[PDB]
Amino acid sequence: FFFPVGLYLPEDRGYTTVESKVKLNDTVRNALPTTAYLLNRDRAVQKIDFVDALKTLCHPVLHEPAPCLQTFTERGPPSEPAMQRLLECRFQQEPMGGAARRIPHFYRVRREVPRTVNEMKQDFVVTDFYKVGNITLYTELHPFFDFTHCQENSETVALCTPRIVIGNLPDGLAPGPFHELRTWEIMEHMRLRPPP
Amino acid sequence: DEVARTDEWKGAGVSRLREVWDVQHRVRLRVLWYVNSFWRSRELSYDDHEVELYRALDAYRARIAVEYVLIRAVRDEIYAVLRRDGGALPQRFACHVSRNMSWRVVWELCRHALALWMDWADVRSCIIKALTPRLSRGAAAAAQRARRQRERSAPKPQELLFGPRNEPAEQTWYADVVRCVRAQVDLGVEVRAARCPRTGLWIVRDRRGRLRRWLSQPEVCVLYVTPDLDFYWVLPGGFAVSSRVTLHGLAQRALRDRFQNFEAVLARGMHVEAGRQEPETPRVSGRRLPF
Amino acid sequence: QALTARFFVPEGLVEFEAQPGALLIRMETGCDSPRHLYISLYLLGIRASNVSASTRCLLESVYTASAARAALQWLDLGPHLLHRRLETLGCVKTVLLTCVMLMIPKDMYLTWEETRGRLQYVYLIIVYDYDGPETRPGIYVLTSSIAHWQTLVDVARGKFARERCSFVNRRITRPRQIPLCTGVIQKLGWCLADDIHTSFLVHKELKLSVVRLDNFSVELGDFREFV
Amino acid sequence: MENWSALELLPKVGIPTDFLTHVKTSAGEEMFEALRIYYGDDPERYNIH
Amino acid sequence: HPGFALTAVRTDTFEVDMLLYSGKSCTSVIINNPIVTKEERDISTTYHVTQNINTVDMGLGYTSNTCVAYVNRVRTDMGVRVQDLFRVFPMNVYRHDEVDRWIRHAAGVERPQLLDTETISMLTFGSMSERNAAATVHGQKAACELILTPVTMDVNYFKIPNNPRGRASCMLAVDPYDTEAATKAIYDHREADAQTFAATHNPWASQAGCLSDVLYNTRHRERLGYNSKFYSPCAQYFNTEEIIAANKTLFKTIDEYLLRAKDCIRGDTDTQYVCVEGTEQLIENPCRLTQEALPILSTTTLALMETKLKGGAGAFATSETHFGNYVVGEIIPLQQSMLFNS
Amino acid sequence: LTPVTMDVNYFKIPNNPRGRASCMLAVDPYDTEAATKAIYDHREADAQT
Amino acid sequence: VENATLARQALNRIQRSNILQSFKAKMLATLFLLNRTRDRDYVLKFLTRLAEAATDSILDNPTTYTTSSGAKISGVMVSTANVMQIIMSLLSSHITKE
Amino acid sequence: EANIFCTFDHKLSIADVGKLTKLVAAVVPIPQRLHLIKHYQLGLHQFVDHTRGYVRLRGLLRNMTLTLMRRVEGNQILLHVPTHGLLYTVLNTGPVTWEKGDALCVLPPLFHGPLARENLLTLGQWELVLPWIVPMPLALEINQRLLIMGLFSLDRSYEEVKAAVQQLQTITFRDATFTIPDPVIDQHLLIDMKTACLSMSMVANLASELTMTYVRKLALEDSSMLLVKCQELLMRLDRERSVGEPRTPARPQHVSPDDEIARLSALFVMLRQLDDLIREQVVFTVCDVSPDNKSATCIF
Amino acid sequence: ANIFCTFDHKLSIADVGKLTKLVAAVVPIPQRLHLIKHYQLGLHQFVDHTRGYVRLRGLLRNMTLTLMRRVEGNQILLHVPTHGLLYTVLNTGPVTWEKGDALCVLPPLFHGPLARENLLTLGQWELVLPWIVPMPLALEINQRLLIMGLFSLDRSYEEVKAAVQQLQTITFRDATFTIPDPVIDQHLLIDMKTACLSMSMVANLASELTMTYVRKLALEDSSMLLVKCQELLMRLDRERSVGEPRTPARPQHVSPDDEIARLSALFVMLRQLDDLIREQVVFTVCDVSPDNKSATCIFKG
Amino acid sequence: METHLYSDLAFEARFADDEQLPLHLVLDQEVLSNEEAETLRYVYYRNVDSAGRSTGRAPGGDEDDAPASDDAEDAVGGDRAFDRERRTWQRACFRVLPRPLELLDYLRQSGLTVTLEKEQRVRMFYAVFTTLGLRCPDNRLSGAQTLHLRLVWPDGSYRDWEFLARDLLREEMEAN
């Protein structure tokens, strides 16, 4: 058996089939899914939350991308040669003090920049992000770590980095209004739902 | 009952602890001064005369300067060989060309590229990684083996009929890639090299096996260096400045101790038998138990 | 199959001894007229340092006898010289008693595994601490699934590093005192994984926390010393 | 590796067969082992050593 | 609410009575007279009598079928108690020691327990670090989760039975003895998986290198220190190499299904411990052959569970949705049947 | 009773009014210490809810 | 009687857990079945389940307590007159005076 | 308890049971000491790993249980553990001669040099590898030789240890040459070196002052051939220690019989502690050897 | 499992009567045949002038021992013991026994005594029987004869003569012996010579190799034990070199063929000591007869 | 900490041979990476005089001062330069503590008496402990000597840091 907890429905396709049977209060503590309820061996309700789930959610192995980075370099680059126009990415060490003056010299050239992978991930709308039309799904591996390929010394080397806050999650994995509903949840936790 | 040295060494403790630096101000590390060291009881004398520290600074200057003056030797080697031929370099690398294309601008890009490479040389460059395997013992042994191998006479039919049979497929070069439009050079390029069957020109490839395709890009330029320490400098179009790297102006022992490939001693985790498959490294963990 | 040993035991040691699960050990006394005494291992408990002081107080309050007094004197002569004096004879069958050629105190019993191995050999381990005044002999009884003697000595060195460095500290601090060994491994037999029951014991109207071993097959082992 | 000459040569008791599926599907999907599926007529059963 | 949705999964056992059907004389049995081997103890003697049995199948196809028809007792608890991940990785700690101590104080587990050597695991077969609880009234329990996206469209994916990884991994579709095409079927995201026509449903579970690929692939669990004695419900899904090795023809697939694809769990303890040399029981697993999990009744609010339970029979097959709340319904009325026979 | 405890799953089902399970059939026979830490130790959850 | 659970066998926690589950389920489900329903065949199969649930005696004289027409008595059940009259009016096809 | 039944997931043909029926009274290792066992953990095939450590296989094998192979009958094996003390018979395939009088040990097998790699049992990927039964002096010889390999080779480049072990890995024992396959260093081997260094430090410490100069006395008194070799070794060690002349010894002051008894008894304790690294306990004591050197009757 | 041992020589019935008093005692035989000539029975085949005691201990270590069971008109019924089974052994050893003792077997020291084995002999054959001595007495008498062997070189002085005069006299419960000196005619026997020289040279190579080898392992991960090992060797060097000339110049560089020869030589010279290092127990007693003439002992080995 | 006692004892042991005084060092995240620290095999050191280029070569110059002649057969002096360079380096004792600590507090957890003039609370993520030995030729030592430091990993790569010995002894040696 398997079941989701905390799964977020969209708002643009919002609907309700059961409105005569039930009606809930307008507070988002009932209008944001954060807990679930199942049935026991006997026909009795039970509540599953994150509070029981922290016995798993705070383990160190969920924050270890080193086997993930290892098997990502074993996967290596994308094989298709026309899909290598996305990996261009430079991590070099530059004198900051002269460059702080010299930033007009960067725009002295007339060549554009290649778009990075994380910028190539934000453009996808919420529903087609799981389709094959996306290209950067092979970069998305972990909710806590962004993964990418970069050209360092003319070598396509893989690199992961911790998404430091939850706002670094991509738009296809967490949309905009989801965060606004999270704010309404945190205002109702702080009891400020009428704002000053 | 004599007190064992560990007890009063434990109760002795530390006088003071301070940090120090390297010469180039890149590394800070901390020294520890136990009061119970015999260095305290050795009462040894100390002096620092100024000409001695001046000799230390000149020795350190040469020890830094070895690879940079090697780079300068490479650069005026290029200058001398472009003055030698008159400036009409031939082609050594297999790539087609177009007649209806102005080569003055790629010549200017070559000048700017060698300029930017001189600004952006490094102790870790192509020629240093090229000549580091030359410093090994097996380099001298295989040099003797190749000098008897290629300089071996044509065989008589007797060993063609009854003698055992004979066997140098592709080369392992290193390269600098200087990109002028982005002002970024490259220092460590590993590249495989081979010859075409139809023509004697070179073909370069990735160490995985992918064909290296930068030679088509006109703004870029490249420097190749071989394990036998030859020298190519290729602007786009496959045309190559070709020479050898000169190092007779450098001392033997300074190059030998400044950088050298290292032969390993036996420690925990490796086979006593040579060339066996290595098991996993010890890898003391900050994540697991020490056990 | 059992090898019988009949014993004439005086009444100065019959405290805590009427139960079957008892081990008599023939130690060479300092006095020469008996030349040896069949001490109990629970008397090796009270001398030991690894045990609790509450069980030591129990062993004092149950063994106020001149026989246990003089036996404690004759074992208190030689500093760490017990393995050159102590020599086992096997477990008591029934008490003047019979012996074959099983109860144990909770504190001196120990294990280094999760005791889920089916076959489990049992061993006696003395250790000689020297960071006390002269010598702290710690007695230990160990059940373990290991069978080969030398890897048991290696895991004992892995578990008794404090005793080893205390031994070499005694060697480097007292040159005129020459110690023989840190201790002795000696097996006594083996049990299955199921008969080990942590239970209670009441003897001479006195209370005790015991661990019983039912299907104990006995096999005499040599006093194989170890550092 | 069974002696298929011993199958083709020896007298065999006849049966009304019943495979559940089609028999060539059962051969191509290995319900059994050592499936000799020669087409036509292979005369290799004739020579005896 | 944090920025993800956890999809939990569990294996729940049932004690069932299955019937069997055979034709007339399907298997010819070949028996002999019993042979006695004598052994002598100290007081008694033990005679081991032994009869050999040969069985010869007298059928081309399948002369015998079976069907699970009735369930009478449910040996598990249908609970939501979460799998103790610290009990299965007893060596991995955080790098800074004080924040690790604060985490263990924040959770229920207390200490990093030292694992054993190769010799101790050779002699002693099992660890079983977590001990039997006090009250075991409900029975044994398990629940393990996957950190998946909150964007994941449930109506396609959670209402029907599916593989919980995001990609269909039943090797009946792929050609047999074709490991390359099978790996391209279960790992490649340049093509669509066959169940739902998208690239995947969750990138944190599907492709190799995700959290699930390093958490539940037992080949990948060998890299870190893990306890094998616990049971994973995810172990029948992210075990990629055994799934590739399972790719045979369908008759051989049926053979290994009814011969080797049956799990074994110790039924005495509340934790799902993986049994070994288990001839005392065998837990047959159809979900391994489907490589798909089963949707269970879940809800969001207590009021919507109230209008489900208060409502008439057959309500659990339906699945309604509010504005932000939802009910997924179990596809078979197992709650209905299992409570109605009582 | 504390006025916060859930009625929706505790009061609909036949339960012990004490709060914990205390049925004493899920305990081992003749195990008094496991029994009393099942009854009164609130460091462990009851087997009912 | 639904599972082979004779007193010589030992039980684990899963055993007693499911036994207590069925205990509560059948304590609630059938408390006063003569007020739950007056169904004929339902109380017939209930009485059969009650009858075969008891184990046999050790000694049983087969000559004793046989009826006419060779039928042999397995056991004897007893209620008060009210329940007896309800059963007599309910299951009269399976009752015989002999 | 005693008779241990094993099985096979795969069928045996007539060839498999034919090569199994010549394996009667061969000793196989079992790790579990259980009754209804399975054939994948039978033998050393689950434990064999090249480039992993011979000393690991050695330690696990001396920790493993041993049993005797008798009476296959088709998908059955009937392993029987030998009881301690009673006479049994053995049948070895290890190409090493035996003797009616010596003792035996059990070692992980080496490659002899013909490199057959067929121990007459293979089930698919799974194969059977048999532990070599080796007479006691060859057993302690290979133990001490791997100990010298582990003790010497630390902090050395590959060429000097290669020149050492091309002549150190070879052992010619009774017209048979053997080489050790995997001499790779181990943490367990490091703790053997630890016990070795502590034991030789202790016998360096509490040895008597006369025994530290005894070979000098016997050198000044008598000249024998082994004494000439001993003087060569000791004076080369002295000139590697000190270029000065080693002085003659005089009347020893501290003569005390109880002192010599105590310090040499502790010395014997420490030599036992050092020798129990390499001195393996016996496993078989020969009552009779077959003339074709295939089988034997051994009392254990 | 019984052995027959016949005599080629004429025996009297009085020879049987002086033979049958050794009814249940241990004899050594070199290897087990079903029928064996009596010239292999007993240690008479090995004992001579110029071998010594340690040869007898080493060849006794692998000589298979056999209890005697019965005497017949010409042949002797021997019975080989088995492990764990009880038997009856008579104490022909020179030391009394007590219950619970651990017994080892060592060669006798009164070769050609005043008893002459109670006059049981033959033409150029005296039947000699090994002593069955308790284990602690066995190990201490081995140590005593070994340190007698150390002082056998320096017998010039008189305080060493008083020390070895203490060494001959042994003490035990109602037992005193004069242990025979292994040096005879101002020379040592060859076995004691090689045993003691090998022991002393093992001590020497240990004292001059332990520093470089504890350094070689201490370049790895370190503990307190190797630290105190190095400190102990520093104590030895600071009490050792107080009169030796300074700057001995021990090098950290040394060619490999030296130290592999050093290690193998140390190992073989300690390897030839384990006949006398380990005391392999062979018996323990479960009941002692009165006047300790015999004992029901359980066989070990 | 444990190499410091042993290295002090060993440099006291070998002080008659080489006259090297020991030098206990600790290093942190400011020099090497944690990935470089979790698998660091060993460390090398060599004391170089202000005028003498080694202590393993000959003191009054060396025959390797003649330049490399661009030869194919013997590349740079043959193998004699190579094993002279193997002689010019020396190994040091070495430990790694990967979990973070504070050496004031951590050396208070061990039994030492941490007696510093002021408690500057210095924190580090991983503490690697070693001890080199710098060679005073006679009893007298010069400040213009330098001490090199190799860090060698199992792949074969190395990192090279050197510093002149006066900077270690600015206020330490003038205090005496």
Numbering used by the authors:
A (entry chain a): 393 to 588
B (entry chain M): 298 to 464, 468 to 591
C (entry chain g): 44 to 138, 145 to 150, 165 to 290
D (entry chain B): 1 to 49
E (entry chain a): 1029 to 1370
F (entry chain B): 1176 to 1224
G (entry chain B): 197 to 294
H (entry chain h): 5 to 304
Reported in the publication:
The main functions of the herpesvirus capsid are to package, transport, and deliver the viral genome.
To explore this hypothesis, we obtained partially-enveloped nucleocapsids by treating HCMV intact virions with detergent immediately before cryoEM sample preparation. Using the same data processing strategy for that of the HCMV intact virion, we sequentially resolved the structures of the C5 portal vertex, the C12 portal, the C1 portal vertex, the C6 portal vertex and the C1 capsid of the partially-enveloped HCMV nucleocapsid at resolutions of 3.9 Å, 4.2 Å, 4.8 Å, 5.3 Å, and 6.3 Å, respectively. Compared with the intact virion, the portal vertex of the partially-enveloped nucleocapsid underwent substantial conformational changes. Second, while the portal vertex, including the triplexes, the MCPs, pp150 and the CVSCs, expanded outward and away from the symmetric axis using the portal-distal end of MCP floor region as a pivot point, the portal moved upwards about 1.9 Å. In addition, MCP and Ta showed some local structural changes in the partially-enveloped capsid. The trunk loop (aa 136–146) of Ta, Tri1, and part of the long helix of the P6 MCP Johnson-fold—involved in interactions with the portal turret and wing of the intact virion, respectively—became flexible. Our investigations with the partially-enveloped capsid showed that the portal and its surrounding capsid proteins undergo conformational changes once the virion envelope is ruptured. On the one hand, the outwards movement of the portal vertex would alleviate the inner capsid pressure to facilitate genome retention during nucleocapsid trafficking.
